[PDB]
């Protein structure tokens with residue numbers, strides 16, 4: 738994926754609810770630092786839904802690609818309000834950005 742393009746997608750569609758940086762604040766949604774290789778619902782100090790806590794998958798390219806296409810289909814009852822990103826290339830660019838930003 739294209740990290741520069743992924744950043745712009747993130748700013749447009751995600752940043753109002755999420756931070757990525759180490760020590761970044763929770764906002765409407767959890768800070769995403771450290772997501773890759775972590776099970777759902779594991780950002781410390783955030784009130785997740787039981788739906789998000791209970792999904793039980795491990796975040797990575799494959800599961801993000803699916804989630805981000807249609808978040809509520811993947812995690813019904815999530816409190817994340819975001820309809821999804823249809824395009825595969827856009828999702829891959831976004832995920833590439835997250836893989837960098839959430840591990841710096």
Ligand code: HEC
Nearest residue numbers: 750751754765766777778779780785786789815816817819
């Ligand atoms: C607010 C209006 C949000 C927008 C826009 C996006 N997200 Fe979100 N996200 C939000 C909340 C409130 C939550 C918690 C949901 C719950 O049911 O408890 C989330 C959760 C996620 C997660 C899961 C985190 C985890 O399991 O630790 C991810 C991976 C995620 N959000 C990513 C994400 C991306 C990449 C976004 C733009 C495409 C995006 N979210 C938008 C709130 C909001």
